[PDB]
Amino acid sequence: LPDLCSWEEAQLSSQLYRNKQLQDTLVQKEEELARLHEENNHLRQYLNSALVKCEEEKAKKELS
Amino acid sequence: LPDLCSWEEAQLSSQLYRNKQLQDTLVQKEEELARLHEENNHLRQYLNSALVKCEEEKAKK
Numbered sequence: 058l059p060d061l062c063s064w065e066e067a068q069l070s071s072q073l074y075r076n077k078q079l080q081d082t083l084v085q086k087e088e089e090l091a092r093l094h095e096e097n098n099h100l101r102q103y104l105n106s107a108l109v110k111c112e113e114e115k116a117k118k119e120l121s
Numbered sequence: 122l123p124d125l126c127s128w129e130e131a132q133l134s135s136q137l138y139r140n141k142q143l144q145d146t147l148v149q150k151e152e153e154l155a156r157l158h159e160e161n162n163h164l165r166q167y168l169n170s171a172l173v174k175c176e177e178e179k180a181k182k
Contacts (some may be wrong), residue, residue, distance in 0.1 A: 058126070062122070062125075064131070065126070066128060066129055069132055069133050072137065072140065075140065076139055076140055079140065079143040080143065082147065083147060083150065086151070086154065087150070088156070089154060090157065091149065093154070100161075100164045104164070104167065104168060107175075
């Protein structure tokens with residue numbers, strides 16, 4: 058029992074360490090995701106806004 | 122001692138399960154990031170192309 062207990066405790070420490078590393082990576086990923094979602098959406102909006110104005114201009118020009 | 126051992130065993134089990142969950146979440150997050158990076162690049166490419174064409178249309182005379 059005491060040799061098993063010491064082995065189990067070491068495995069637990071190693072597991073908690075690996076999980077902490079995963080957890081930290083996951084925080085970094087979530088914020089990278091949030092950044093990209095916001096940038097993609099804004100870029101999308103900007104493109105749509107500019108392209109629409111280009112077409113509005115052609116419409117009112119090409120009427121006479 | 123015997124109380125600590127059972128607590129540590131139960132924690133090994135919970136933490137193995139936690140590891141799996143974190144691993145599963147991470148593969149899903151990486152897939153999502155890979156797609157958003159692809160989209161971001163395409164959006165920047167499209168933007169560049171639209172700036173050029175916007176500019177060339179200002180061949181205004």
